[PDB]
């Protein structure tokens, strides 16, 4: 869409206000560079005339050479200087955009982040923001130099000869006239061939990710021929696009060839006494022809580079396409009041017909009514299509609700998260260790805890019983996504992290879900005893050991449709009995 | 550059298209220099001749040279960009076939799913980088070298000393400057790949663990550490822009040195002539123009390091040893097959081991029960010959499994893998994969008979399906795996886990789907469920890699045993 395309670059050009000083020095230095180009073409033309027509020995021209050397050093200075100024332009926008992407990605919090994979956010922040650098560092300063420099040559040549300045200026409207005239084909070839090239670009990776399936059916030899067929079709379809895009590039190369040829043959003839016109009623000199001929290739040099830098606009608008939507999606946020609890003792959760709302707007849990007195241990069990984990997020503060979820008599919508979360500690599946060393992951809860109290958490969590296997023990590094520790050994650190605090509420989002046979026992052994001290609320799909838990809530599409202890509720024959049947039947 | 040799041998196929695309680059550059060199001489010779020499001066030959030089300058560039990109795609296809033809014998375990499958995006990206070698490295470098030599030889006919200093400066910067800048900016390029991956790691560990970091009160301390890495990363990026800025300034000073040297030296004497006249402009304009051939040469060498690195990864990844070898005997596929195992491991060994030693008759449906956490079965990996068994021997119809060639082994065994793949192709191609000779009617019947009536919609078989287009659900995707196995029509069928992650309303429907349609085949199933084991026979209960109980459901359940305990209770 061109309306979107127009408003995408409107976003791009309004992100440039940050570091507009750097984009003004670049535009100023493009004007200075366009003058030092004229200065050197005048000195070189005046030296050349002196030693060709007037037979002046080179030793008598030591002043123009000194100036000619000086305008080469200065002109090489601004090229070094405006490449550095141009970079500082691209670096500032990226830093400021990345700061308000991470900021926007932190206010939304865990609820929105887990909607997309982790590598999807890294592309948005690593790959999609570094794609806008060449737009501001190279492409944007070039549109300044593509309009400033060529006008300086036309202004400089005009006093000498208006016919030489009309050859250059005559092609100024002709180039965009013909570039757009052949641009209908480039906008047509990319309409018929857009769908197929989308399917073909990505075909090799698709066949490469399914070599296991190709192997088991004996189609390896017959998919080499499909790669051959899908590449012949890709080549000739993507050359019909390029064959029109090299006419646009070749048009500029045609008019620079015509202008250099017309300058050479107009001046060459006029010196010879044929084709007398264009000068201001004065004999055309050799230094006039040389100045025009030296500056003719440089009239189109700024426009040529703008063609090579145009791909930088292609990627920086695609990057702006995925970044403008991101910063404009309406997002829900907890009201995060200013109330604070005054009791370290376990809280009493009471809920009166509250819906848990995803940040995008849709509700995840229906009408919930429940009550947890102090010290009670609830448990939520469902068919994985229940959205029971959304209740845990709402208690954590990551989700917004339109009911009443007052904790200890105080509405959770009014609690300050920075002080409410001090009473909160939680465990969950797919545990994440962000800290560097295994000792620091545990101490992430509180770095002021005594090392003796550290040993209590490292012992009660059954994590000190596999520390000797690790190289350095407590201080062993934890690699990328906790690669050194197995998933069973990782969660026992997370349990040790939770046990390091005297929390008032504990939240277990399916611990021991994908753990091994033994690590699940060690986690459950330590985390059943921990749940007794303070009120908890645990999500499970292991229904075997729930006999000692105070109350059980089953969710079906987001409602508490049964309540009561395991013993009387197992034999009731409701959905839980059928729910437990599916658990017992699957060994 | 030794690692780049195996891929330069792929250029032998297109040595004419590749070489022509370089010849058109030199002709375009030679006409670029010739147009401005001839123009500079033509203006000087005309002015020196003057109006008094209008009839004497031969102005029709130089004025026809500028017409020819201005036509091949613009037509040669169009064809150069055209031929080069045509041949770039003809070696991309050759590269795509070459790696895919060498990753097939390594397909099951040679790759080994390393780096959590971040491997296959780096193979498409590395294959696309070996593509750039001709157009980003070879074409700019070979073209520039022989443009320098032609003008050096061409100017030699006028003056040897002038030609050698102009060409010598141009040759010297062609061979000295690119290596010096690649060597000067190698510490930063190393310090920038390391800081890019460090920021990416600190970011992923900050977004994945945002729930943990927020509640434990440290989401603003790891943001500071994350932001400090970006500051160090932006400094490495900045310091590689100061070299690019310094290399662009030095190229301008070197091209300035050549122009000034020609002005100062060609005015003294040209070709033994005290009064060179118009010759002075032939050299100062051949020095103004000839340095555009050197414009792409530093960036070309900078990329050769990236191309070489990619060639090493592709050479080590596809330069391995296949785990199995398939003898070629042209055997005949059996109509009925009886799988016989003898002391072969069921899963990988653990905690530091006799085999299964089961026997399956010609048409017996057999199920194998295993605990979820103990391990992942390697029976289908070994039965499809992903790797040779360390112990024991697999016999297919009383003959060792190694004797069957690849063509016939794939036809006796039809598996339904746990991880079933959606090829980005029409629904016909996802089904025609199994039986390549079926008709549009046969595919339609199977799609209905498996319960995929939704897919046979108005769009039909031709509907695009896969990554680009439609995505299937787990239950719907499971029926697609069975659809292929029914079309493949092998005597033996292996079922990795036919019902995993499916709800009871479709978990059941799959069971009579397998039972009603695989009744004549030697199906062997592996599950961690006890729903449909009733329709099977010789149920095998596996415990710690050993058969503890074996027998049909009723007989095995009637006697107290491990299978009896599985039925009721945890």
Residue numbers in the entry:
A (entry chain D): 2 to 588
B (entry chain C): 1 to 352, 356 to 573
Paper text:
The ABC transporter CydDC plays a central role in the biogenesis of membrane-integrated and soluble cytochromes. Here, we used cellular, biochemical, structural and computational methods to characterize the structure and function of the heterodimeric bacterial ABC transporter CydDC. We provide multi-level evidence that CydDC is a heme transporter required for functional maturation of cytochrome bd, a pharmaceutically relevant drug target.
The successful determination of the IFasisolatedapo conformation was followed by a screen for substrate molecules binding to CydDC. Next, we analyzed the dynamics of heme placed near the lateral entry site of CydDC in the IFasisolatedapo state. Analysis of nonbonded interaction energies between heme and IFasisolatedapo shows that electrostatic interactions between K3D, K7D, K314D and R192D and the heme propionates play a key role in attracting heme toward the lateral entry site.
